[PDB]
Design an enzyme around this catalytic site. Structure first.
Site, PDB file in Angstrom:
ATOM      1  N   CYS A 196       4.002   2.116   9.005  1.00 43.85           N
ATOM      2  CA  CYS A 196       3.647   1.074   8.355  1.00 43.85           C
ATOM      3  C   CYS A 196       5.250   0.575   7.587  1.00 43.85           C
ATOM      4  CB  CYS A 196       2.755   1.136   6.937  1.00 43.85           C
ATOM      5  SG  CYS A 196       1.155   1.496   7.526  1.00 43.85           S
ATOM      6  N   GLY A 241       2.581   6.612   9.258  1.00 45.82           N
ATOM      7  CA  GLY A 241       4.248   6.619   8.851  1.00 45.82           C
ATOM      8  C   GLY A 241       4.998   5.278   9.378  1.00 45.82           C
ATOM      9  N   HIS A 267       0.931  -1.360   0.056  1.00 43.55           N
ATOM     10  CA  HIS A 267       0.105  -0.048   0.069  1.00 43.55           C
ATOM     11  C   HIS A 267       0.905   1.388   0.019  1.00 43.55           C
ATOM     12  CE1 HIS A 267       0.022   0.041   4.394  1.00 43.55           C
ATOM     13  NE2 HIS A 267       0.034   1.290   4.266  1.00 43.55           N
TER      14      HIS A 267
END
Ligand SMILES: C[C@@H](C(=O)O)c1ccc2c(c1)[nH]c1ccc(Cl)cc12
Ligand SMILES: C[C@@H](C(=O)O)c1ccc2c(c1)[nH]c1ccc(Cl)cc12
EC number: 3.4.19.12
Lengths: 304, 304
Positions: free
Chosen positions: B145, B143, B41
């Protein structure tokens, strides 16, 4: 979202851990530049620990008696000196992995991370607070002495603790990196009872602000209090008195949430008087006090 | 003595964290050998996350659109591929700090450490457990991830988790390093409710053994139970059923303490039915379930 008891990343400190052996005693040392710092009781046997005369015991030690090993490589000791309760061993090689560092003496209520080590090898990392009675509740087995506590500000490591002793009650005592014990403790195996382990009020309040930010709000009430009224309840529950300095430190969290500090004190007052009623706050069934206001801001903003 | 929620030392993993940016999205990547792994993603905007067609979105991306930065130096991307929910970016430089590593898919109830990162920079480390509903209760802001979960066996890092999503209820979901989500979760911003967060019984028992080893013994009683009787109470309290495999795993702790596993189950049964009565176990007012039997043995023996 989510709020965890988080330690600083330990890599910069892992690069400094060495094994120090003197005679039959092995513990950990901290290698920064060309100096290795370790508890002076590395020169003692368990028998010596009952009534050690450190100056006398140290006369029988020469540089070659201190075996310092960094990984699988031996460091050459070219000098040694005792500074308070720490030994400083001068080695002929500067640690190539020495980070930017400072030695700081922390105040009670301040938090730090501990890299627990055995034989100069890191085993784990956890977050501690210096208790108001100057003990820490750590996880230290035989061989962990010399493991250190630290905080990191971007790329600078502030070393604040070195582990030395386990009191007969299972709590821990140690020094700053200048070798001065926190609190009244000494490096002798004797009756050393700790004082009252009071709760760090400003940290509990910071953690209640973290709970509000992260969604846990059930404990917010319709009340307010004053510092003096709150402190009457704090005394009853063995909480540290809240000062105007603490209120000022909580200012940024009060601004972010819109909850006045004294309103949060009134929520805390009700939690102290009524209990949790089987409920939890941030996954805890007790009021957590090992997050400072700075920790809450840091974790809630993602400081790297 | 002392028992803490301890994470593995994070240095070996800090050496692998990089920043990955695609368009306006920036998250973390894991650089091992000449491959950077990150959540797929990274190619989405928050708008795309509502109904993303990853294959279609990826067609518009070329190697030069994936900006990979390790510290302050840029890595050259020479290939990319999507494997389940992870993107693998082939770079022209092998990570010189690549530790010995494996990719493992953990079972629910297993614990691991998380190195929370932002912009490829480590912020903190904490110890997690994969919940029985396949969520984790972490500390992840925007942030984070691409931050990873791992275990270390001496010098080998077993990577088991990569952070991908925060469910609308504030719990976290992610994948193994092959890109397969734990549990039924998907990388789409949609209603994804978690199932029952049951308590990991075998871990609570391991932690009660840690409490006995470390001095906390008030909860030991004069009773025993059977697996079937205990499981009737476990069901009522949303605890995972205890199996003979769990009893076998607790064997070493039972041997060390001299407390039969079923006797400890009877202590746990009484704690479930009667509560703590305002008392604590290892500084906790609830029954802790994020220590496996292996964690208890490791911490109580000082494995480095
Ligand atoms: C252990 C360490 C320290 O006290 O910092 C140490 C110990 C001994 C020396 C040192 C640093 N620098 C020296 C320069 C000259 C001479 Cl004659 C001795 C020493
Ligand atoms: C991202 C990574 C991977 O899938 O492992 C990757 C991606 C692309 C390639 C790769 C590894 N090795 C190659 C060898 C020849 C060609 Cl034509 C392409 C690639």
């Amino acid at each position: 979202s989510g709020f965890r008891k988080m330690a600083f990343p330990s890599g910069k400190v892992e690069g400094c851990m060495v094994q120090v052996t003197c005679g039959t005693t092995t513990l950990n040392g901290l290698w920064l530049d060309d100096v290795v710092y370790c508890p002076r009781h590395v020169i003692c046997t368990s028998e010596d620990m009952l009534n050690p005369n450190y100056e006398d015991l140290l006369i029988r030690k020469s540089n070659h008696n201190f075996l310092v090993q960094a990984g699988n490589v031996q460091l050459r000791v070219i000098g040694h000196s005792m500074q308070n309760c720490v030994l400083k061993l001068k080695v002929d090689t500067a640690n190539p992995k020495t980070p930017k560092y400072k030695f700081v003496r922390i105040q009670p209520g301040q938090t730090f991370s501990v890299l627990a080590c055995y034989n100069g090898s890191p085993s784990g990392v956890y977050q501690c607070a210096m208790r108001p009675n100057f003990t820490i509740k750590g996880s230290f087995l035989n061989g962990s002495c010399g493991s250190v506590g630290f905080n990191i500000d971007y790329d600078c490591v502030s070393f604040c603790y070195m582990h030395h002793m386990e009191l007969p009650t299972g709590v821990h005592a140690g020094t700053d990196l200048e070798g001065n014990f926190y609190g009244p403790f000494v490096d002798r195996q004797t009756a050393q009872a700790a004082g009252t382990d009071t709760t760090i009020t400003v940290n509990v309040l910071a953690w209640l602000y973290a709970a509000v930010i992260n969604g846990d709000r059930w404990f917010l009430n319709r009340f307010t209090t004053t510092l003096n009224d709150f402190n009457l309840v704090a005394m009853k529950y063995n909480y540290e008195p809240l000062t105007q300095d603490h209120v000022d430190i909580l200012g940024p969290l009060s601004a972010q949430t819109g909850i006045a500090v004294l309103d949060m004190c009134a929520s805390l007052k009700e939690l102290l008087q009524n209990g949790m009623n089987g409920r939890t706050i941030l996954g805890s069934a007790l009021l957590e006090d090992e997050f400072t206001p700075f920790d809450v801001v840091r974790q809630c903003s993602g400081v790297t």
